Every structure is written in C-alpha cells, then in structure tokens.
DNA sequence: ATGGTGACGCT
DNA sequence: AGCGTCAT
C-alpha cells in the first residue's frame, strides 16, 4: 500500500493529426474538403497506393494499403491527390514541411518528443503544476474542456454521442478534489485543459484538426488518443486502468503489435492486457526477457517509466525506393542513376536541415533488398559521410555495395536489387 | 506489387 | 557494426 509505486507520478499526452496527409491536402484544395478523400502514391499500378484516408471515406471501407482502383469499387465518388514525385520517385517534402509547422506550435506548451511525421508526445508536468497555482485552488469548468471525453464515465446509477461525452465529463468534474494540489486525477485534468487550448492553437494556426490522449504516461497517452478519433481528445486515468485492460487485446498496446505480443498470446493463453496481472514479475521476465518482462508487469497495471524525450527533429534523414517484381534493377548502370537519384534527394534535404538545424550528418548508411528475400534489408553497409555532394554520396554507396554483385558479367548486376536507401545519420553541431 | 519512411534493441 | 522489430 504506502510504497506500491501507481505510476502517476507525470501528465503526458499524445497529439496525432487526424488523417494527417489528407488533411495537408484539403487544405491546400478546397474542392476536398469535407469529402470521401485519399492520398495516393504512383498512380499508373491500379491507381496507386492509398496512404491516407479520410473518415468519409473510412465510412465506405477504405483503407491504407489499397490500390486506388480497389478503393473506387468501394466509394465510387472517392476523390484523390497525388503524393508529388521528383527524381523518378514519391517526395514527401509537402508532408514534413506540414508536420514542422505542427511540431513548432506544440513546442511553445512544453518540451516534445517527436515520434512520427503527424505526433508528439508533451511532458505536461511542470506546465500543470504552474497552472494549478494560478488556479487559486478554483473549479474547473466543463466550458474548458469541450471536446474532452474520460474514459470508463459515464457509469453507474441521451442517446446521442455528444449527450454521452457531456454526462462523463459531469461526473467527473463533480467528483474531483479540487483543493490538492497534488491529486493525479486533478493533474491530469488540468493536463487536459492545456491540451485543449494546444489542440485549438494547432487548428487556429494551421487548419489542421487533431486527437489526443492524456494520461500518466506514454502508452497510456498514445492508447488514449486512439479511443475518440477524430478531432478529440481523451483522459485515461490511473482509475480507468483495470475496465479498459479487462477487454482490451494486446496487441492495441504500443510495441505489441507484433511478434512479441503473438508470443504473450500464445506462450501464456490470455488475450487481454489486464490478464497480464496474474503473473509475477519473475515469471514474465522468464518467458520474454528482463526488459520485456518488467515492462509488461508494470505496464499491464498502468504504469510505464519511458520518459518523454526533448527530441523535436528526426535523428535521421533517409531516402528509398522499391523496384517490385520485374522492375528489379539488373544493370550496373541502372543501379547508379537510381542511387543517384537517392542522393540527390539526399543532398537537397540535407543542405536544408544543416541551414535549418544547425547540424551535419556525418555517416551515411547504404540498404538493398534483393530479389527473393522478403526482409525490409537484405544488406546495409556504412561509410563516411564528409561532402553534401550527390555525386559523391551515389559513387560511395556504390562502392560499399558494388561485391554484392554476384554476375560474372561486367555491366549487368544480378540477383537484381529490389530496394535501394540511402540514409544520412550520426548528426554533430555545426 | 501498399511504399517510403524513422526510432531503437540485440549481439 | 550489421541485423531485426515495430510503427506510422
Ligand atoms: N503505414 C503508414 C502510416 C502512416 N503514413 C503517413 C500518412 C498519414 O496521414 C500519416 C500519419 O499516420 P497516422 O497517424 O498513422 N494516420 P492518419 O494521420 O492518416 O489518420 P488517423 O487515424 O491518425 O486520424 O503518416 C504512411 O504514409 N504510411
Ligand atoms: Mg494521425
Ligand atoms: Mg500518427
């Protein structure tokens, strides 16, 4: 009881932009506002890819990872826009140049952690507690919090969504401890007040809508955001921990997605995170590790250590491109043009983030896939990366992976590649 | 033949 | 260092 760490010692919270891409999209062309909508990539294989998807669009079963013509058998009135292409290949200049002028904005409440292109997470802890001073011990209002909704209320002893959120949000409100200060619940309260007022400045200074979550923690946070999308946000209490896990899969908790979370399944038979609970420490860590073990111990009661980073830039700046079924390259000469192409993408977005961020990247990592093999990698090599020069950059990844080429003939390459990437990392001041 | 990314853990 | 996992 009085040393059993809760885990709600932080206010943290999630903001992810609602069908990010989408959205950078309407706003730049009013004609797909408020439609069935879609970004597509590389439109002459089945009307290219969808990459995002807007909730209108969502309503008819459109998904990322279909082809576009698919979709249209779906939602025959379905609009689309184009990813732009430079150098023979799909360039997400629009979109990173849109998640900055999010992740600036964010940046004025607190310290973030940038972990995609379209979220972050904040630390609001020190931000809460100077508000909480400032509110001289004084209630809270649910006029500061119009698009918030508290997981697990309303509850106990209106059928319309709004009705519902509104009912939660009261019993809440009406149960919380206003006059100390050091409350979790009340932490994570003001927490979400401030998010509100992070959440209007993201769409009154961009025209982008957002989620968000709000909790004592980074998977709580993340997991929350999730429950109310789009263009709302949601308080997951230490309190709601036990109902939530009770029926949630594991593999909707961030990091079980995917091998490791089959594994929890199968080696222990449950199917839900709050099962989790039932085994000891010792006996987690015996079947998935030391780490994973602890993490899962802790994290199945709602409690998780990892700390919001003060990372704002990407730690990398990387450029790829596939070359599926009998587009594999096969000729020497191919294999450069198109490494060539890499750099020079490589080098205009590296030019601009060393004027911009006062820094130079210093390795420079060199990917190929090769037909047959269904790994992300095949095979990566590093090298020096001492000159922003694509020319330069193209013949130093060529040498490092030029004895790949299993040919005996000079000017062909087999196996033929399927991936090329290069990426530009180990950032020093300049 | 979703593709183009990006962070981080393991040995 | 180079490989693998997870995710958006
Ligand atoms: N596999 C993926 C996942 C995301 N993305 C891009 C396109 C997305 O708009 C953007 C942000 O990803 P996301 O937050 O997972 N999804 P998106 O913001 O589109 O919709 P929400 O479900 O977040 O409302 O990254 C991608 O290109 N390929
Ligand atoms: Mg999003
Ligand atoms: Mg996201």
Excluded at 71 to 85: G, I, N, S, T
Aim: glycine letters at 6%; a positive charge.
């Amino acid at each position: 009881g009085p040393h059993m760490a809760t885990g709600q010692d932080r206010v943290v919270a999630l903001v992810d932009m609602d069908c990010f891409f989408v959205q950078v999209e309407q706003r730049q062309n009013p004609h797909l506002r408020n439609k069935p909508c879609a970004v597509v990539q590389y439109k002459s294989w089945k009307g290219g890819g969808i990459i995002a998807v807007s909730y209108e669009a969502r309503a008819f079963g459109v998904t990322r990872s279909m082809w576009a013509d698919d979709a249209k058998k779906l939602c025959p009135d379905l609009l689309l826009a184009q990813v732009r292409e430079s150098r023979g290949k799909a360039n997400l200049t629009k979109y990173r140049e849109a998640s900055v002028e999010v992740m600036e904005i964010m940046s004025r409440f607190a310290v973030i952690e940038r972990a995609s292109i379209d979220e972050a997470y904040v630390d609001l802890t020190s931000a809460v507690q100077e508000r909480l001073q400032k509110l001289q011990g004084q209630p809270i209002s649910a006029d500061l919090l119009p698009s918030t909704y508290i997981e697990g209320l309303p509850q106990g002893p209106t059928v319309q969504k709004e009705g519902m959120r509104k009912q939660g949000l009261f019993q809440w409100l009406d149960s919380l401890q206003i006059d100390n200060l050091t409350s979790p619940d009340l932490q994570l309260t003001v927490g979400a007040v401030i998010v509100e007022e992070m959440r209007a400045a993201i769409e009154r200074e961009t025209g982008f809508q957002c989620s968000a979550g709000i909790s004592h923690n980074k998977v709580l946070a993340k997991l929350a955001c999730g429950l109310n999308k789009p263009n709302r946000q949601t308080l997951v209490s230490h309190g709601s921990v036990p109902q939530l896990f009770s029926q949630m899969p594991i593999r909707k908790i961030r990091s079980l997605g995917g091998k490791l979370g089959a594994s929890v399944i199968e080696i222990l038979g449950i199917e839900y995170m709050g099962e989790l609970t039932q085994f000891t420490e010792s006996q987690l860590q015996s079947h998935f590790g030391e780490k994973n073990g602890s993490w899962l111990y802790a994290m199945c009661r709602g409690i998780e250590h990892d700390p919001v980073k003060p990372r704002q830039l990407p730690k990398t700046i990387g450029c790829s491109k596939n070359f599926p079924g009998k587009t594999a390259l096969a000729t020497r000469e191919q294999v450069q043009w198109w490494l060539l192409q890499l750099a020079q993408e490589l080098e205009e977005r590296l030019t601009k983030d060393r004027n911009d961020n006062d820094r130079v990247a210093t390795q420079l990592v060199v990917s190929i896939r090769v037909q047959g093999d269904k790994r992300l990698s095949s095979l990566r090599r590093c090298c020096a990366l001492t000159r922003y020069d694509a020319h330069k950059m193209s013949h130093d990844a060529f040498t490092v992976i030029k004895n790949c080429n299993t040919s005996g003939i000079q000017t062909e390459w087999s196996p033929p590649l399927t991936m090329l990437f290069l990426c530009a990392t180990k950032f020093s001041a300049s």
